[PDB]
Coordinates of N, CA and C and ligand atoms in Angstrom, one line a residue:
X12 N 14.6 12.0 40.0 CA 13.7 11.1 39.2 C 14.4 9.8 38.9
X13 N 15.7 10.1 38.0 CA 16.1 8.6 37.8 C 17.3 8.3 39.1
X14 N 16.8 7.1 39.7 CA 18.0 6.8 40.8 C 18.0 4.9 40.7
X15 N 19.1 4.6 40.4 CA 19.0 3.2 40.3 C 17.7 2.4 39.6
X16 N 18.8 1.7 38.9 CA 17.7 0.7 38.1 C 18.2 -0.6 37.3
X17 N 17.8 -1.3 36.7 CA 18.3 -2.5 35.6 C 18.5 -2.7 34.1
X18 N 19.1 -2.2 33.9 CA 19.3 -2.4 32.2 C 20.3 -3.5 31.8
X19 N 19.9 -3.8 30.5 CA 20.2 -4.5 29.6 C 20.7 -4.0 28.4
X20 N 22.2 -4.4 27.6 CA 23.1 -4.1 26.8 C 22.3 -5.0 25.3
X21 N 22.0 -4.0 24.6 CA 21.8 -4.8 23.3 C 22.5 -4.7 22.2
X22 N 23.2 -3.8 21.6 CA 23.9 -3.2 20.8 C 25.3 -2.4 21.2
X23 N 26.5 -2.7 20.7 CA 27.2 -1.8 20.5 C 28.0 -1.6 19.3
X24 N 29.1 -0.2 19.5 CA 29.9 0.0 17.8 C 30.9 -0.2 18.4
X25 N 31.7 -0.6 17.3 CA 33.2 -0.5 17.2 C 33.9 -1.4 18.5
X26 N 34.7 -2.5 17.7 CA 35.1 -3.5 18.6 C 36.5 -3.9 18.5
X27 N 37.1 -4.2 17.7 CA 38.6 -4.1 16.9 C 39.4 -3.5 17.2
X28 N 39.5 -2.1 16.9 CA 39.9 -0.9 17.2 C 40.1 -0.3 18.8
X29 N 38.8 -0.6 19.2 CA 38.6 -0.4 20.5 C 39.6 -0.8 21.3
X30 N 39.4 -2.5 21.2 CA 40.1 -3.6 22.1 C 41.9 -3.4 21.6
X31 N 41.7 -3.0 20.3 CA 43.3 -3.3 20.0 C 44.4 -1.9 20.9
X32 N 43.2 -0.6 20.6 CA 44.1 0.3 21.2 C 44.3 0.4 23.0
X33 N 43.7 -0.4 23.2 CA 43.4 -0.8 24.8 C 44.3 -1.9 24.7
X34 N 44.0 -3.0 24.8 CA 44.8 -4.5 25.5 C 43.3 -5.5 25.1
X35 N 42.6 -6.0 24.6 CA 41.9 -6.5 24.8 C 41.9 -7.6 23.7
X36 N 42.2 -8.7 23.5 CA 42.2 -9.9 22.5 C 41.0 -9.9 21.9
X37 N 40.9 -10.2 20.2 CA 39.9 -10.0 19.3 C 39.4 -11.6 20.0
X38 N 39.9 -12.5 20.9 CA 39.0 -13.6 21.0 C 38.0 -13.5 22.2
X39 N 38.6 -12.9 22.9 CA 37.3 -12.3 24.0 C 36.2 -11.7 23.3
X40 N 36.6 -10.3 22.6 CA 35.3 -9.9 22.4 C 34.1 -10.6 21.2
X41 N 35.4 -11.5 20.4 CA 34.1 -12.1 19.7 C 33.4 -13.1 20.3
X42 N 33.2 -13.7 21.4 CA 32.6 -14.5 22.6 C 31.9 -13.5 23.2
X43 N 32.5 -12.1 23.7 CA 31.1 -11.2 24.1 C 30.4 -10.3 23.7
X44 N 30.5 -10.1 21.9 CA 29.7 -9.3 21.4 C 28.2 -10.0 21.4
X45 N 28.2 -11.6 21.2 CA 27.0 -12.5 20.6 C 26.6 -12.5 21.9
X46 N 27.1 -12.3 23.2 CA 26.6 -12.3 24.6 C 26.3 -11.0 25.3
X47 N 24.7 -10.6 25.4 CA 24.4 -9.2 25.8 C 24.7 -9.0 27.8
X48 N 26.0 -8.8 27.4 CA 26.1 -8.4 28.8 C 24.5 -7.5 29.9
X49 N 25.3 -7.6 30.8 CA 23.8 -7.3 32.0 C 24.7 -6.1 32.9
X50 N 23.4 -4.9 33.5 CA 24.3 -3.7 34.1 C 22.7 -3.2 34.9
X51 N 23.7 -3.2 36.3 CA 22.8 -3.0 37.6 C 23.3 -1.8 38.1
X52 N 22.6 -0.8 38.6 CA 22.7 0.6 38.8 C 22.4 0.4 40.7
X53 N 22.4 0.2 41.7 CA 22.7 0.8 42.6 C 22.6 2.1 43.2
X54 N 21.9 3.0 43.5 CA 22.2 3.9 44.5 C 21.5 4.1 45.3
X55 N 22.5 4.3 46.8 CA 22.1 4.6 48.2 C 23.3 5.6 48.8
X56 N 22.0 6.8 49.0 CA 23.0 7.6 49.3 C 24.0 8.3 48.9
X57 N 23.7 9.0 47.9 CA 24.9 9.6 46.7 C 25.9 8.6 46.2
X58 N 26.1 7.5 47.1 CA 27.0 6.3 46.8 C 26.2 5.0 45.9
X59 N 26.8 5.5 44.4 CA 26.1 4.4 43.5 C 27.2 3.3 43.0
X60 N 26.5 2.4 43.1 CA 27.2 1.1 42.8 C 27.1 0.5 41.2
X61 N 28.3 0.5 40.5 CA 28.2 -0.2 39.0 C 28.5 -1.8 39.1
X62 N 27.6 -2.5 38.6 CA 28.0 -4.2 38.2 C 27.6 -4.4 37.1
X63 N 28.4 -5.3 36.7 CA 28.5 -5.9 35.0 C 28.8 -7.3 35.0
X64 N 28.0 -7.9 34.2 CA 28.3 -9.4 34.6 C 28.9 -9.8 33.2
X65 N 29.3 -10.3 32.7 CA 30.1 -11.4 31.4 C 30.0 -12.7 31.7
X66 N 28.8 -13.1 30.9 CA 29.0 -14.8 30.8 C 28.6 -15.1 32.5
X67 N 29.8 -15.4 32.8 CA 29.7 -15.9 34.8 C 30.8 -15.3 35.2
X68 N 30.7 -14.6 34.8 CA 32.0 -13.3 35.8 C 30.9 -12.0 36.4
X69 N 31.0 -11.6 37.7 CA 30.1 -10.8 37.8 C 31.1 -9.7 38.8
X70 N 31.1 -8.3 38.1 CA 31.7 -7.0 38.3 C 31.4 -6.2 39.5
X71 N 31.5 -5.6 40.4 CA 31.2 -5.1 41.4 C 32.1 -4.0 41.5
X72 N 31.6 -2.5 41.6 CA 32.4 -1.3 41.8 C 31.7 -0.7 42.6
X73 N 32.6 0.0 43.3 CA 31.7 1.2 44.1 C 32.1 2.7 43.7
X74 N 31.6 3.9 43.9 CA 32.3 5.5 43.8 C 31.7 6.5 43.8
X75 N 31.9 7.3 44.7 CA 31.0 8.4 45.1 C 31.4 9.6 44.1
X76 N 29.8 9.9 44.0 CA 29.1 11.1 43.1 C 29.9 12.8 43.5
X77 N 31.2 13.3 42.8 CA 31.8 14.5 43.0 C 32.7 14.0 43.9
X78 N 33.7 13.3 43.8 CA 34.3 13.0 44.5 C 35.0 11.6 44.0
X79 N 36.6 12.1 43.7 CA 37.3 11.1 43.0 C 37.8 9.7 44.0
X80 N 37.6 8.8 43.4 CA 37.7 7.7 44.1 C 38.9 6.5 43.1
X81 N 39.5 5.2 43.7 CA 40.3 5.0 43.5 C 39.9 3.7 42.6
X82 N 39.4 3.1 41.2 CA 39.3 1.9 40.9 C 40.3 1.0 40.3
X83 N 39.9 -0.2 40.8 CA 41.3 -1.2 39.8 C 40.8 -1.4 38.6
X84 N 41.3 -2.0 37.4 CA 41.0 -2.0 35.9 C 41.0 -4.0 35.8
X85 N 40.9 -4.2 34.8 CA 41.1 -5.5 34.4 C 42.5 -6.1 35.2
X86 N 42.7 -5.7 35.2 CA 44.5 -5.9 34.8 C 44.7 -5.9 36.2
X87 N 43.7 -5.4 37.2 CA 44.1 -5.3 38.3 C 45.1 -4.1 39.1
X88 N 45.4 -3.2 37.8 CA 46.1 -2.0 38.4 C 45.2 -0.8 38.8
X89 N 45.5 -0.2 39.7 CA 44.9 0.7 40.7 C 44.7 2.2 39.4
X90 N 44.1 2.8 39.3 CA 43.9 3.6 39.0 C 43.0 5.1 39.3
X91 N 43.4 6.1 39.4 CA 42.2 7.4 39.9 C 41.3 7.9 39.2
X92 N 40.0 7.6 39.6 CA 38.5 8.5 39.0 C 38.1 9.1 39.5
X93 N 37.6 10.5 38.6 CA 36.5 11.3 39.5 C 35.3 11.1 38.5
X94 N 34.4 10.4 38.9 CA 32.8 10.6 38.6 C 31.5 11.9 39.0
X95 N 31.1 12.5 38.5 CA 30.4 13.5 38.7 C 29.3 13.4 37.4
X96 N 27.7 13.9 38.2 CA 26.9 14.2 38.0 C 26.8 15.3 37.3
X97 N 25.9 15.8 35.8 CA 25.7 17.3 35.5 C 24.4 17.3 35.6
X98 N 23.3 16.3 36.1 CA 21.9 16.8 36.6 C 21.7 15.7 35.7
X99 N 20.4 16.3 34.9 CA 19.4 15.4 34.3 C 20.1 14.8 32.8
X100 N 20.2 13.5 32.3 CA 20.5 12.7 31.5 C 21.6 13.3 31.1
X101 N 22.4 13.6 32.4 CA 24.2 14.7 31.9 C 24.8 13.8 32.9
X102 N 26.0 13.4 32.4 CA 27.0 12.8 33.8 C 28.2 13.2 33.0
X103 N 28.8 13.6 33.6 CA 30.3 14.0 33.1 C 31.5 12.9 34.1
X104 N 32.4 12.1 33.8 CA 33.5 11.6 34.5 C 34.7 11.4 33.6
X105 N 35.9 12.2 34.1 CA 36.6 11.4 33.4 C 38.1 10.7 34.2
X106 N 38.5 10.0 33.6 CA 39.7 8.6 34.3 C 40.9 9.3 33.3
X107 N 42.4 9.6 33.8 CA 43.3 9.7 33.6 C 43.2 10.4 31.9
X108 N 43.2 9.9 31.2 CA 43.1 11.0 29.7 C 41.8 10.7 29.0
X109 N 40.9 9.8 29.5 CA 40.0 9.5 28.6 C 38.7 10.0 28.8
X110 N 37.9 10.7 28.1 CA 36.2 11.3 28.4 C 35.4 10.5 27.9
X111 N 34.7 10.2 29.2 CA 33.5 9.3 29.4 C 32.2 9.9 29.8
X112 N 31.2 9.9 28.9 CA 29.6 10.9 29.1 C 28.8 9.7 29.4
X113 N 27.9 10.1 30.0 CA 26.6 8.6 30.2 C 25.5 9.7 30.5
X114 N 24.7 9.1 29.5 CA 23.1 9.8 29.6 C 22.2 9.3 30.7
X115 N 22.0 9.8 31.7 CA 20.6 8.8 32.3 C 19.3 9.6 32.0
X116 N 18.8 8.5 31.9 CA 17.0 8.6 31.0 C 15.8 7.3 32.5
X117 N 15.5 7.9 32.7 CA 14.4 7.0 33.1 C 13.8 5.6 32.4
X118 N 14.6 5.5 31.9 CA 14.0 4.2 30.5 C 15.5 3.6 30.1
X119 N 16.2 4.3 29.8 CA 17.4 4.0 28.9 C 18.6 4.4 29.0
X120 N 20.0 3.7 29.2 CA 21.2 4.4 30.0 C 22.2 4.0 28.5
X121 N 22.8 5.3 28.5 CA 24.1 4.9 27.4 C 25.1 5.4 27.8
X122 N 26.1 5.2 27.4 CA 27.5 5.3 27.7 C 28.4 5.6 26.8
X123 N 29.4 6.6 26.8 CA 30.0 7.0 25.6 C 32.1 7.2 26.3
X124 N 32.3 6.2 25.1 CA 34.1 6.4 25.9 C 35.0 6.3 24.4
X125 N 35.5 7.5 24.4 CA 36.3 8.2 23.2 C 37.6 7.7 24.0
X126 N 38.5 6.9 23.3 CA 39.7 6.9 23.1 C 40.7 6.7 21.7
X127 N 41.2 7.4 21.1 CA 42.0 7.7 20.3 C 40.9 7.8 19.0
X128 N 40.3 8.3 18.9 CA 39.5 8.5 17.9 C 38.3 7.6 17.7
X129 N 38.6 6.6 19.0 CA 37.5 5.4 19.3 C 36.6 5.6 19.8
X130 N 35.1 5.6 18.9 CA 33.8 5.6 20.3 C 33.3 4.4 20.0
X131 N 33.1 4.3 21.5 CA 32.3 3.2 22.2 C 31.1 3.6 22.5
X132 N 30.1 2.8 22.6 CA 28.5 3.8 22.6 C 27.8 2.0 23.1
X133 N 27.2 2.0 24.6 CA 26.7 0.7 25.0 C 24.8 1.5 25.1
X134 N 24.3 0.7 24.3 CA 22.9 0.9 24.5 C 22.4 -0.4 25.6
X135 N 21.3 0.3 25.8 CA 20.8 -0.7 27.7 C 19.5 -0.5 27.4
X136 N 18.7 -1.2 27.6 CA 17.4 -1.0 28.1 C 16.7 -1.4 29.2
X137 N 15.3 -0.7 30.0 CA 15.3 -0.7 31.1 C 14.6 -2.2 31.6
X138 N 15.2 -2.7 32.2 CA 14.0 -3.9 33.0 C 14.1 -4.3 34.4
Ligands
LIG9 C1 35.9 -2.1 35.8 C2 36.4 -3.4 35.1 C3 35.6 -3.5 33.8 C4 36.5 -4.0 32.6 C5 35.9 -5.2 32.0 C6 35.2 -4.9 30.7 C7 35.9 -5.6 29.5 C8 35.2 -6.9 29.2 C9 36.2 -7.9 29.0 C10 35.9 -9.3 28.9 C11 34.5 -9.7 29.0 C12 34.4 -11.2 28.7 C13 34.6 -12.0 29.9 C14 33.5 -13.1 30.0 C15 34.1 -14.4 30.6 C16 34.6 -15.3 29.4 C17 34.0 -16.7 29.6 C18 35.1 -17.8 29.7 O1 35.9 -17.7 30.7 O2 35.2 -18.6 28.8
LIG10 C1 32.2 -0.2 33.1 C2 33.1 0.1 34.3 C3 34.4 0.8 33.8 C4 34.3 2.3 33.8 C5 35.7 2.9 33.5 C6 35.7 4.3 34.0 C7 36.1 4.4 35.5 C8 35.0 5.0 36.3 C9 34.3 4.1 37.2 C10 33.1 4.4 37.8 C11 32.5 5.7 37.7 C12 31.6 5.7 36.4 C13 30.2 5.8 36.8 C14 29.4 6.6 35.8 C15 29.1 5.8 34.5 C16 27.8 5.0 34.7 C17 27.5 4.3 33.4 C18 26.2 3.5 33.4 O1 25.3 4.0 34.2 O2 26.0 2.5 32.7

């Protein structure tokens, strides 16, 4: 039912904390909290594609569904994911120590990334 689609980022929590226990400068994200990032879904083929644009930077990933694949991070370092599907508005993946859930909804995509006691929670809606 849901296979690729367009959503838009309206809201998120927790930004400080986030960025600080990661690497991320509190001056970046106060420049992209006030700026609703954009997120394009892709798929063809069990092979779905994630992009995220910031401002004029625009993100391009690729990684197949059950089957761990190799992405780079900001930083440009190489890192190993397995992404995996649990059916309907269930996705389970997770990246080296951190659990990451994403609901897909026919309408509405969220994202959820727990690190050190940090949730991140990106609400999107469909267009
Ligand atoms: C898979 C890689 C995803 C990691 C990136 C997500 C973190 C977002 C970090 C910064 C977003 C803000 C960048 C926008 C460009 C700033 C504009 C400028 O250059 O002045
Ligand atoms: C935002 C990109 C950075 C993600 C960091 C985790 C690395 C895994 C990368 C790709 C596999 C994840 C794909 C499943 C999540 C989709 C989320 C969404 O639909 O908005």
């Amino acid at each position: 039912m849901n296979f690729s689609g367009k959503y838009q980022v309206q809201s998120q929590e927790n930004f400080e904390p986030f960025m600080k226990a990661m690497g991320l400068p509190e001056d970046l994200i106060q420049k992209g909290k006030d700026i609703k990032g954009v997120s394009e879904i892709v798929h063809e083929g069990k092979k779905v594609k994630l992009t995220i644009t910031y401002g004029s930077k625009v993100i391009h990933n690729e990684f197949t569904l059950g089957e761990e694949c190799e992405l780079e991070t900001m930083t440009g370092e190489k890192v190993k994911a397995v992404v995996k599907m649990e059916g309907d508005n269930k996705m389970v993946t997770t990246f080296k120590g951190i659990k990451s859930v994403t609901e897909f909804n026919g309408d509405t995509i969220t994202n959820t990334m727990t690190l050190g006691d940090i949730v991140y929670k990106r609400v999107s809606k469909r267009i």
